[PDB]
Amino acid sequence: SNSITENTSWNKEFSAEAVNGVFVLCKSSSKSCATNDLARASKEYLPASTFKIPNAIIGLETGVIKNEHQVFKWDGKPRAMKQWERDLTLRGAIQVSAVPVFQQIAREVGEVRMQKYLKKFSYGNQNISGGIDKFWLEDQLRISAVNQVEFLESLYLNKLSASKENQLIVKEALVTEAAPEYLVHSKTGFSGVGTESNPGVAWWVGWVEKETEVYFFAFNMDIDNESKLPLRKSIPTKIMESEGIIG
Amino acid sequence: NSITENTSWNKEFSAEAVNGVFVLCKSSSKSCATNDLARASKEYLPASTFKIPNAIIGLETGVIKNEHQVFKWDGKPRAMKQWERDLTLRGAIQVSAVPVFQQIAREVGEVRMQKYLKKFSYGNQNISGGIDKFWLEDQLRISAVNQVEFLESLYLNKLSASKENQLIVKEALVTEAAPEYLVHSKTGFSGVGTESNPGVAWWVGWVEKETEVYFFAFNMDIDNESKLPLRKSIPTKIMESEGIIG
Ligand SMILES: *C(=O)/C=C/NCC(=O)CCO
Ligand SMILES: *C(=O)/C=C/NCC(=O)CCO
Ligand SMILES: [Cl-]
């Protein structure tokens, strides 16, 4: 039976940087999750670029993305970021969070199929209103940290409603750190700075394959200044280092 | 097809007094560059680099039941302390857990092992001398060029195995991840032999960088365990100077 507990030993990592946020860490073998804040762990926020994980799976499952070697060609038209003005592989597009590449994937998938897959995946509030290519950036789609770790555990076990081949392709594209004892798969997200009363959200979600154990994690925090952005990885990294998972 | 000799990497070898070869191919195994044409095609014991085909064969035959198979340690002494623990497939590959792969090979058996090495065009395909040590001590031999051809087939999912099984092994071979590139690689060491008949050390793999791919295979004569670090530092310095990694 799945369980969750609230911890306090991680609060010092948040208050030291004056951050309002939540970390959820689940140990696969014990089906046990721990968090610094049960209420915020259940609160649903815009997934932003973390939506690229289900978007990639749906793109492959629908055939919009032909295979793992698919190249997304840049047509030479100006893009919002210098980093996106080039041909990208699936891993390249995921690594730099290339919004235009995923906007085009979502358009070819279409609203009917996108809605079907988000329901099969139990992904957040499953609300894709506001436009087929912006409902995850600044739309109505919301997902909690607890829902993110449930979704990533399904992906890890190849239990999503998609071919094992397509789940394996996305799992390898999400590798961000490799060491002899562990492999980190992760994805960042940032909705924007919002306002002082309504700050934006920053995410870091993923999982760590350490020896024979697997740890699923989801971090989110309020962000009103782009200088705080490095904290989306430093806070969860410091917590997982103190737990002996990475480092 | 062609192999072209590149004298600009000799410095990395002579600075360390190493007798070895580096083979580097961009996009495909059609055009490879090397410091030594003769040694690039010379066949050597694969040692732990054989864990790559052994893992694919184990998955294809069902000996390795699935992606998340745990290889339990029975508690009996193993030749290295890092092998005395339960291991995932990636864990067994990354610490080169010989006894895990010896038991996989025994269960695959000589007939199936021969069939797959023929399908994979894996070196001289000689598995004689003992099903649990042919790649460590006997007559199996493969060249640096044949290693890059085999890894290119794996990269393209063109080996005679399911795409699922090739994807499982490719993920188990990831050894370095950066925003710009992903390195898949495997080390090998036959032992020290003698000053006159040295052992061999390997480093083989590929680098997925932006939209480009680079296949590499390194081997060197080795008669002292103190020289093992060179099997990664020499090819690493060559690929860093080529702007592929670092
Ligand atoms: C996914 O997380 C994409 C993020 N793009 C950048 C922003 O959302 C910030 C806008 O200035
Ligand atoms: C993988 O290449 C493992 C190598 N181990 C060392 C030997 O096989 C020789 C001495 O045990
Ligand atoms: Cl991002």
Ligand SMILES: [Cl-]
């Ligand atoms: Cl080795």
